[PDB]
Design a binder for these strands. Sequence first.
DNA 1: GAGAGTATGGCCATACTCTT
DNA 2: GAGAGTATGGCCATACTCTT
Lengths: 481, 481, 189, 189
Amino acid sequence: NERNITSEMRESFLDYAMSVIVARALPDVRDGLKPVHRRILYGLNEQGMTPDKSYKKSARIVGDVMGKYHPHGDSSIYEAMVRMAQDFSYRYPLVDGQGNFGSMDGDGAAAMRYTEARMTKITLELLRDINKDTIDFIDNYDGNEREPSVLPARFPNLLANGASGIAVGMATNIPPHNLTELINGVLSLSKNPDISIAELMEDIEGPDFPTAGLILGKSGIRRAYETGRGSIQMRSRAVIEERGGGRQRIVVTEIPFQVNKARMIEKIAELVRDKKIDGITDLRDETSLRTGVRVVIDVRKDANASVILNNLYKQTPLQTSFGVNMIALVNGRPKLINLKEALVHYLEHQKTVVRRRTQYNLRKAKDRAHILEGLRIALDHIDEIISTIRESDTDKVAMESLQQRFKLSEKQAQAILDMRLRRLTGLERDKIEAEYNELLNYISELETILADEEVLLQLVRDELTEIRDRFGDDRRTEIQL
Amino acid sequence: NERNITSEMRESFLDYAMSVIVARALPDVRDGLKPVHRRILYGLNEQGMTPDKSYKKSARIVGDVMGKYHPHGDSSIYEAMVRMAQDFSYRYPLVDGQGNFGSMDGDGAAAMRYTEARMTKITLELLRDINKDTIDFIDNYDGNEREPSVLPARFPNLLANGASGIAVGMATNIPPHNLTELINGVLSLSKNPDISIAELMEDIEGPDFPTAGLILGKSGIRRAYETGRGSIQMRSRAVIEERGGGRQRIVVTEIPFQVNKARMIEKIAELVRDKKIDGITDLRDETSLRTGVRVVIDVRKDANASVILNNLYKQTPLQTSFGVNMIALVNGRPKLINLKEALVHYLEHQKTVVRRRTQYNLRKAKDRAHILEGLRIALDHIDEIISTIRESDTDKVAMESLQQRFKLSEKQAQAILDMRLRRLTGLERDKIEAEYNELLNYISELETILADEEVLLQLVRDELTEIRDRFGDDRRTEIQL
Amino acid sequence: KLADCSSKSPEECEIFLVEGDSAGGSTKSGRDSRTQAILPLRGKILNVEKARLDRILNNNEIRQMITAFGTGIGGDFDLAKARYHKIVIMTDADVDGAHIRTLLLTFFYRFMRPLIEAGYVYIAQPPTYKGLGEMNADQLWETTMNPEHRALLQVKLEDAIEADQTFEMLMGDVVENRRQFIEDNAVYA
Amino acid sequence: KLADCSSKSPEECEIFLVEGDSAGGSTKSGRDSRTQAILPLRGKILNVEKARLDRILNNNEIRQMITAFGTGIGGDFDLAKARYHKIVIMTDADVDGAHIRTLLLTFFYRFMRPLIEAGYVYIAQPPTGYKGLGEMNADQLWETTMNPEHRALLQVKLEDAIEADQTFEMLMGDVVENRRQFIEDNAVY
DNA sequence: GAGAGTATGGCCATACTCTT
DNA sequence: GAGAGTATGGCCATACTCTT
Ligand SMILES: O=c1c2nccn2c2cc(F)c(-c3ccncc3)cc2n1C1CC1
Ligand SMILES: O=c1c2nccn2c2cc(F)c(-c3ccncc3)cc2n1C1CC1
Ligand SMILES: [Mn+2]
Ligand SMILES: [Mn+2]
Ligand code: NA
């Protein structure tokens, strides 16, 4: 009949606000992903796009993701996927990209018509053990398909690659981190639930940006890790060097995180043009793939280059600040979390994953041990088995006789009926016995794990340490003073 | 070295023209399709988008065709697919579309995001028996898939839906036709290979446009069907009728093929505005879904309305000609063809398709008869077979023993070793025997066809007639004299 | 992109606001062209509660709506000049559609409040996962376009002090109030 | 959209005409900024042979090439004003990239003939294959096609001015029949 | 500032040829 | 002539937070 306007406003806003908050703009604290990213990677797994396989066309990748899980526009999906493939956006890229996927200068990637993609090796670790009933699945938008509610995330990806998202009523800004340091942190925490932030900071010095550069001071760090919020100052890496004739120059090899380089040069150009900055005779971008990033500024003869450099930090994006605002979904709700919180929730995710994995393996193994027993029984009593089947007119009749004559379960009987005649040869009988013995030992080991919380915990520590050794790398960002 | 400019121009130009001629702008005489259309239809098949299944998002359809078979921009593909889904463009639509797929005002269809598509039922007859080895496949552009060189085309689709295509150094314009008459013509041609274009024209009266209308005179049809090139005059269907007060109006209910309506109406309005036609007082587009096309031109009281109508035919697309130029790929190269070569080349395609299919039915029948003969030998002496297998230590030995003891081929022995234990039950035994007996009769039926070219033909005639009865429809366009 | 009815009588004329140009581009083939107009919205609509007048007036999307209604804005707004006595908000039945809906209701409530009070503003309601989009124009016309089967909702204003606060709280440039409201009312299940 | 090189001495300079701004974007990342420049052409460029003169003048695409070459067109041509001593036509090694090339050569042969005699017109040689220029990474465009140490460019030359006159007229000329006959005579099916 | 990031589609240019 | 129909990308609006 009628729709009171104030009611319509409050109800309609909350749907968008909650939906943007819990289903778009904020990462899950456990795997560090927002839904579009998670659906891209899960889609890359489901399609069969692993690092050992062919690069696959983006349009089909995007279309598969959009049709199956993400009911939104294709550009959003492609752009999200492209970012995961840029070594200057992602400290630990999740997508391997073939073709023009962009550059630091802000020239965007090519149309999805020209690019192909697949997982990187490290993304296998995000999807490791997904099938083994480690994470809860949910229905997709139309109900046709199942999607993961969260990935196993066998490395701490929230902190490793960071996040930035604008939501409604809040936003988030989490900087990337060094993986060797994060994992060492998680290990320390797993040995001491009462570990302090300062103690954690011994293992985790601060952010580590894919673009290197420098951070000025640990005090901005320390507040961000203690509280979830803090301003961290990032500097470009620049030196002063002679160029001949008694003249000098300023050479920049690294720039701040999320800073368009081409745009930064323009701002420096403008400053000069507007005479706001004094003493710059030339400005050239000498960046090349072979040489890396090189930005050259030519100081006027007998001018102080150190002063000019300081002004550039002051009046330019050369020195930029990163506003840490660590907000993530915790139990499906937005929450501001400090560094220890983030690791605590992560470690609890890993325990759940490994536990749930051991349980699935144990269940899977026992079922096989049970089927093997029927095969062992069937092989020993084979002659009778064959006549029993031959006597019977139907599978149903044949099944019934086998459960009577040999006290077999329905599954055991169906397995026997499904057996191929080639399983009757001499090697197979020995082969079956060998496998069965292996399972029993395997089941013993699985049950041992489940019984002891400490044993389970140690396994997590062990699997994290292998990932650290294989994927952990040198810190790129220097933390000065 | 260097390159002679004259040599460059000749080679580069010839490279383009030939590709445009043989792989873009011209239809194949056998299935009536240009590459992009064939790839779209094949792509719908492979995706499983049959008419019994639900509509699919157009973007996914296109992304698959583009990546798999057509390395070209999406607009070319999407727009080609849209055309095939419009009743005013295709006399027998090959694509079923959900959403806004266009109108006769020239307003385009909706973007790929907003439309859904699948095969029409008639398209299943273009794709019928494609798997049964009836046409030659070729490698696709990147080596990574296979695509059809031509579709089986169980109904004469070049002539029925027509074609229009601008190439290089030539072009093509074939009008659509009525399916019932087309097939009756093929039938007459099959009974009489020295039949004359005149005689064929007792079945094929002329074109049959999706939009109905009138063709003025039989004189330019005949020229086109005899020489391949002719002009055909089209007229809107228009009547003169009272509207009250001793006043009249001209009412147009059908417009010529490929005429844009909205444009046509604007040309009339403009003529009125610029006083280049006397006597029109109002102009309304009254067209609905319900009531068909209805364009009303109200006529000044006591002015003559036939005379106004006649002028509108002279000055507006309300009367329009269609320039027949029937060029198609015949044995992979462009050729101007008359009505008989079109039908000859089609009917020869149908004989090839049907023969090749029967032969393939044979080969896989005979193949399967062979396997069932093995299983029957096994079932006849099952106790010895089991013993032979159990005595062997490896599958290879069991294979060689089975072949040796019972005179089985390698294929038969492999089949026996793969046979499950449940196939020994009474019902499962009876099934092997029953399949064999039916298969001997089928093999006998197939050999009858291939021993006798007249049987093989008669089968083409029957299958064509079945298609004609199910899909043939009334003629829409009136041929006036 | 505006489509307008044959009738110039504002009493029997209705204008549809659709999210998606060819979401509404379908409708045109389906819609009764005698009494129905279509105004497609390209994207998210300027949030007028957060924008100053020069920016509002300059915005293309807003200008089209003003022009289409023809009443003018603010002080010069004239009711008797409304070109349609039904204005319908047709959005996707999803959260971005909900978000868009709040933006529009904001535009009306701040710049054309009289229109709301008359009862000229309505909210269309299509089929109870597929929004306006992959849907036949005839189907679109049948579910919500035709007067003989459709279920529109009339936007009532009850308390103007409450609406002022609510619009300011939800659409204002102060983020904290909006976050606070979300925390208090969001229920997760 | 021209992306100019760092140096200002034309003897060492090269300019690249790139098909599509995917191939182009890639080329801007890949090239030697110091000695190489990129100009992408967005669409099928006009056939200057068939078309009226004034169309050639209002055209943007034609205009961006004139500006880049730095000479002026036809009668005002200054080969000493040539901004680049190397002009590279870089298009996909597909039949459509062949077409664009013929069109560009036609423009040079009718309005900047003095450059073909000079010898600064070159045709790049990308890897042949299914892959186009847009689908390749920036550094593989460099190693295979733009690097002076490993690339293979072909110098365009004019070896007979009346023959070329007759060829350009026949292939790009208004008459279709001459073009059809050349195809019939020379096509290998 | 305006930009960090996922969300919600129109409008352009050209080549090529023909009705005996 | 005219416009039929397969081919050849880019541009750019908005909401939403926070900040240097
Ligand atoms: O691929 C397309 C395309 N598909 C549909 C429309 N267009 C285009 C429309 C266009 F108007 C233009 C274009 C516009 C202006 N100058 C050059 C090309 C290009 C299109 N292109 C590619 C060449 C880029
Ligand atoms: O879907 C898109 C989109 N994908 C990539 C870029 N855009 C858009 C860019 C755009 F600039 C606009 C737009 C342009 C002009 N006026 C409003 C929106 C719309 C885009 N849309 C439509 C959903 C809105
Ligand atoms: Mn929607
Ligand atoms: Mn290409
Ligand atoms: Na700064």
